[PDB]
Design a protein around this ligand. Structure first.
Ligand SMILES: Nc1ncnc2c1ncn2[C@@H]1O[C@H](CSCC[C@H](N)C(=O)O)[C@@H](O)[C@H]1O
Length: 213
């Protein structure tokens, strides 16, 4: 029901979440330590667990209500832990092989995003990876309208309940997105040696930074 609704609301769900899982699996060992930042109900963590049965997952979010859904999802998983913390709070020490996030960091002020990327690099092993599945802003107001039309086209084609899309729109009024190339450059500024946009469907993109490679 919830997982079904996320697919209705998010264009190219399988491509974007799948790209995050694939780039992690090609970058870290089977026994990787992975932090999911803003894990919510643990959808990205769940996608990673499907590919990496031996990975240790730490799911972090500020919302206990969202993390209760993650606890239920991972009830029988002995290699999953949960941490309640804001992105702006001290990160867990790690070190981590991967830090991943989906549709969470766009909630922060731009300065706090730039600082967060730097703080993430500090808890990554050398050669570690940061991956973000993100809601991104178009580089112009005219393109932003086209991004919006493409998002709405997916939502309508997916037979999304009108009430859930209306609720989606209200949530998006408080979002602080920026264009994908600005954020990717912030990874370079944070001291990641490589940063790339792996996959994109207009408003939604999967990008990554590597801590040494
Ligand atoms: N400043 C902040 N610190 C921590 N978590 C935050 C946050 N701002 C938003 N969040 C969390 O980010 C999540 C956004 S929804 C995305 C959930 C999950 N990553 C998924 O892919 O489905 C929510 O769980 C919300 O509580």
């Amino acid at each position: 029901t919830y997982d079904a609704l996320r697919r209705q609301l998010i264009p190219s769900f399988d491509l974007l979440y799948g790209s995050a899982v694939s780039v992690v699996a090609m970058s870290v060992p089977a026994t990787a330590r992975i932090l999911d930042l803003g894990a919510g109900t643990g959808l990205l963590g769940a996608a990673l667990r499907e590919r990496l049965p031996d990975a240790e997952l730490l799911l972090q979010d500020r919302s206990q209500a969202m993390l209760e859904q993650a606890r239920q999802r991972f009830a029988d998983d002995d290699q999953v832990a949960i941490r309640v913390a804001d992105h702006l709070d001290e990160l867990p020490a790690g070190p981590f092989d991967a830090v991943v996030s989906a549709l969470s960091i766009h909630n922060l002020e731009h300065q706090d995003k730039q600082d967060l990327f730097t703080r993430i690099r500090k808890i990554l092993r050398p050669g570690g990876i940061f991956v973000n599945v993100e809601q991104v802003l178009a580089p112009t107001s005219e393109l932003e309208k086209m991004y919006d039309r493409q998002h709405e086209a997916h939502v309508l084609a997916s037979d999304t309940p009108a009430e859930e899309w209306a609720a989606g729109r209200e949530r998006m009024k408080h979002d602080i997105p920026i264009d994908v190339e600005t954020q990717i450059q912030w990874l370079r500024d944070a001291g990641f040696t490589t940063a790339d946009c792996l996959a994109k469907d207009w408003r939604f993109a999967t990008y990554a930074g590597w801590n040494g490679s």
